[PDB]
Design a protein around this ligand. Sequence first.
Ligand SMILES: [K+]
Ligand SMILES: [K+]
Ligand SMILES: [K+]
Ligand SMILES: [K+]
Ligand SMILES: [K+]
Ligand SMILES: [K+]
Ligand SMILES: [K+]
Ligand SMILES: [K+]
Ligand SMILES: [Mg+2]
Ligand SMILES: [Mg+2]
Ligand SMILES: [Mg+2]
Ligand SMILES: [Mg+2]
Ligand SMILES: [Mg+2]
Ligand SMILES: [Mg+2]
Ligand SMILES: [Mg+2]
Ligand SMILES: [Mg+2]
Ligand SMILES: [Mg+2]
Ligand SMILES: [Mg+2]
Ligand SMILES: [Mg+2]
Ligand SMILES: [Mg+2]
Ligand SMILES: [Mg+2]
Lengths: 31, 89, 106, 245, 68, 95, 126
Amino acid sequence: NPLFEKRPKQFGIGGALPPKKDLHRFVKWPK
Amino acid sequence: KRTKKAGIVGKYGTRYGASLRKQIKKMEVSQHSKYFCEFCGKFAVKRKAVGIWGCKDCGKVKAGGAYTMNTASAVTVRSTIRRLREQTE
Amino acid sequence: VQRLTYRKRHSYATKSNQTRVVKTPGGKLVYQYTKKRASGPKCPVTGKKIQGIPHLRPTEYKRSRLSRNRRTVNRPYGGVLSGPAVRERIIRAFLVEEQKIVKKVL
Amino acid sequence: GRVIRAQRKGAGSVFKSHTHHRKGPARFRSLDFGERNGYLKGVVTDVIHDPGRGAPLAKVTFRHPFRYKHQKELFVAAEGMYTGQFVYCGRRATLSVGNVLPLRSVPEGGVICNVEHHVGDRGVFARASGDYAIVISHNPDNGTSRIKLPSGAKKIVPSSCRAMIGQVAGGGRTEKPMLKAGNAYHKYRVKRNSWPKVRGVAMNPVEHPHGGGNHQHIGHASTVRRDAPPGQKVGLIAARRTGRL
Amino acid sequence: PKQIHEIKDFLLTARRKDARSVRIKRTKDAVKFKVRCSRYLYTLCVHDTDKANKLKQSLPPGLNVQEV
Amino acid sequence: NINNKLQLVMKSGKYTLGYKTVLKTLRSSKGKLIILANNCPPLRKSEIEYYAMLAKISVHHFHGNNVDLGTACGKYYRVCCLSILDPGDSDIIST
Amino acid sequence: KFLKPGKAVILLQGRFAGRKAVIVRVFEEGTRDRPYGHCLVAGLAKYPKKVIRKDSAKKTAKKSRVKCFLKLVNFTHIMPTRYTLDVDFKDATRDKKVASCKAAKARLEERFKTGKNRWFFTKLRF
RNA sequence: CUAAGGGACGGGGUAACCCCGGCAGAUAGCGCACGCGCCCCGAAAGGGAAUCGGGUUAAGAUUUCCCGAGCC
RNA sequence: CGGCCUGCCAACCCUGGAAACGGUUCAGCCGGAGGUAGGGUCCAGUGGCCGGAAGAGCACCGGGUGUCCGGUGCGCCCCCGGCGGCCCAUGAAAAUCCGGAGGACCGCCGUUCACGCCCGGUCGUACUCAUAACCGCAUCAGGUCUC
RNA sequence: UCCGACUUUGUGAAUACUUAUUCCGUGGGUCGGAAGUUUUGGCUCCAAGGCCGGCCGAU
Ligand SMILES: [K+]
Ligand SMILES: [K+]
Ligand SMILES: [K+]
Ligand SMILES: [K+]
Ligand SMILES: [K+]
Ligand SMILES: [K+]
Ligand SMILES: [K+]
Ligand SMILES: [K+]
Ligand SMILES: [Mg+2]
Ligand SMILES: [Mg+2]
Ligand SMILES: [Mg+2]
Ligand SMILES: [Mg+2]
Ligand SMILES: [Mg+2]
Ligand SMILES: [Mg+2]
Ligand SMILES: [Mg+2]
Ligand SMILES: [Mg+2]
Ligand SMILES: [Mg+2]
Ligand SMILES: [Mg+2]
Ligand SMILES: [Mg+2]
Ligand SMILES: [Mg+2]
Ligand SMILES: [Mg+2]
């Protein structure tokens, strides 16, 4: 189907907003 | 006319001393002057507050000197920063 | 000459207590309380007035109190940006986008 | 005696600073990954006046690095900054006036303002109108930099500390004579309760060490030890010399 | 209060269920027909003598009519 | 040597001065050359170059201000952009 | 010379500001009613929506629909682009106008499904 | 509703009365399982939903009752 | 309060292209970054007409008559508009309301339209506000914020 | 308030370390090791796509 196409995102410092990552090791846990 | 030497400083009358009035004269003149706008090319830049210089027509607002649009050291700093930037390359 | 009194218990000439003098069918003068003068919508990029919308107090723009044609302008960014601002954004959006393609090719 | 005026200011009752019409703290954006490794572009939207501050402030808008949100900053404006101007913060920002750079990226002799003392301080040095710091030298071994402060003191700072390029706007402010008690009244009305100062010799001994006498005179040396108790420490404190050279 | 211009629109308004009464006020110029509805009082001005009479006779029989 | 050649175009050739008439000649493809002052608004500058790229008209960036332009054309008002549609006896186009 | 039928433009003012349109006829000199130069354009009032593989067959048929408007535009209210869209249009009453709009809608929906002219159907962001 | 400001959970100090609010503490919840997540008090002159004319008493209504006409 | 008209001073739009420069204020100031000119859009009014509404109120005559037409202004009070000046002084916040960008999702279902139906809690409300209703031991030549 | 002793107070080399303690920053948002965006005062989120709820895209 010619309508379907790729729409890539470049994830630079000032690029597209990043997707959700794990971020587990940076979590601020309860005391 | 109307005055031989006082000029803008005649609003102060006989007060504060002749040397102080002569001191304040240059800054009173310069802070009420109209300055050239490099962005639009008109003499429409007026002081809005100390350090703030806004053009009337094009609407650009620029951070400058207290009583003059460009201070002397501002030009010197720009040249030093420009030379450092080029020689950095 | 028919001097006047306030009609409520506000005794101070504040901006929210402004009055006007009117003649009644009873042949006398009374005070009527007016609304404070309000700015209309303003453009954030030019600072100029937004055409087509009246200058009211904020709660007089409420949907139940004002018609929809009075509230809006039929253009993108209708009551928010003026026409000159919208033209500049369209041109900037297209011209910078073309430059991005040219940067990619070169 | 009674508590002197110098002591009463620490209670902060009527001596607190007048801050009701201030526009907020002026400082860099919090240091993050984009600044630490690249550059981030913001646009100057306003150049505004802050009561009690000689230097104008610059309102700058960034795009948030990972949230779909705007990020609005406000720091001291360098001279020459203007509305609609793109400023760049970070390690790879160009050496241009109005840009925020780490000190490692500024060569020797550069004029800088709002210089951090600790990495992530958001700017501690050379913030008053017309003031600036000078980059003197760089040490790659310790990763430190030598800067010259407006008072003339040399200072060693980490090379990762951030500074804005240029000098602070509004210079030359104090060259103009005030000419009037009323002009001084308006200046300090928006700062603090400090302006009209009564001389200690014009007081009674109950109120001041200089007070009393049948003539207005201090009656003892106005130079005072560094370790004198509060209430006693008035005059010239720990002075190495006096007089006009 | 609102004014009605054409006669037919007054006819439909007087036929509304929420219409309560019609007042006929005679002036030296024209004849005013006022129908009291739920929210508004509607006034129609008839400048013709016979059109006033034709309106008087053609009113809905269920509506009250008052002479002012 | 561009101030003298532009001075000769105003003396013998045909031209138009100002933003709105520069765009009109580009739409009708009458201009042979566009001249832009160095302080011409960047949005305005970009749009004129794009118009000139749609046609096949060259754009020269004048070395000076918009106050300097116009003075070069011998007028007492500022000129942001200029369009040449006839030089006549001027070699400005072949340069 | 770049304002010809088949050339793509962008409207800068009015109800359809920021919309993409194709030129159909150019009145370069202008008529007597309109002294200025102006053209008849056919533009997208509603862009076809983002069509992806995950979608079901009925839904992607709904996302491919377009709406078309016809408008006479002053040359000064148009941003001329470098792109070109040719669909052989060759074009008064409120009934003739809407019918002609429906014909162009069928041709433009068919062009979009072909996969070509991706820039023309992908909106503008300002 | 917020202003200058005041009180105050946890925490800290304190023999206890009590003194400390930025010191960050799983913040005590909000939309449609899923998603998001940076206390109160304090102005009858500040901000602010919506009313007008005429009449009426011994004493009210300088817009509260009556008549009529509106509004939120 | 509702409808129609009008449309100040600014602001904006379209055409067009200005030196022999012009337009213009009490003052300013404005123009190839588009003036003068021509034609329009919007804005506000405590502006006009109609409805409300003459049936009211008022003034006369004993139910009746009338409630009309103009002029003027460095006038006074209030409000608004638009300029100019001043600051090492730049002169609140929040509730609340409106608009917008995007378009996931959805079809006999959408509808910020008109008309229609129901409801609207608690507390204050008299009077004085001063050479006699407040404080000054008083029915005190004092003091006490306003239109 | 300055100054010394003890306590907090540990470890290893011929002065170094970091976990106690202290200070600073953040909505604890890319730390350590390895492998392989300068643009004009515009918009930018909730992934397209590929391959088998799952992986890559996003080491
Ligand atoms: K409107
Ligand atoms: K004491
Ligand atoms: K004081
Ligand atoms: K003194
Ligand atoms: K003494
Ligand atoms: K209140
Ligand atoms: K009462
Ligand atoms: K009294
Ligand atoms: Mg004495
Ligand atoms: Mg003493
Ligand atoms: Mg609250
Ligand atoms: Mg507070
Ligand atoms: Mg406690
Ligand atoms: Mg409260
Ligand atoms: Mg109030
Ligand atoms: Mg009473
Ligand atoms: Mg005109
Ligand atoms: Mg009437
Ligand atoms: Mg009567
Ligand atoms: Mg008065
Ligand atoms: Mg939309």
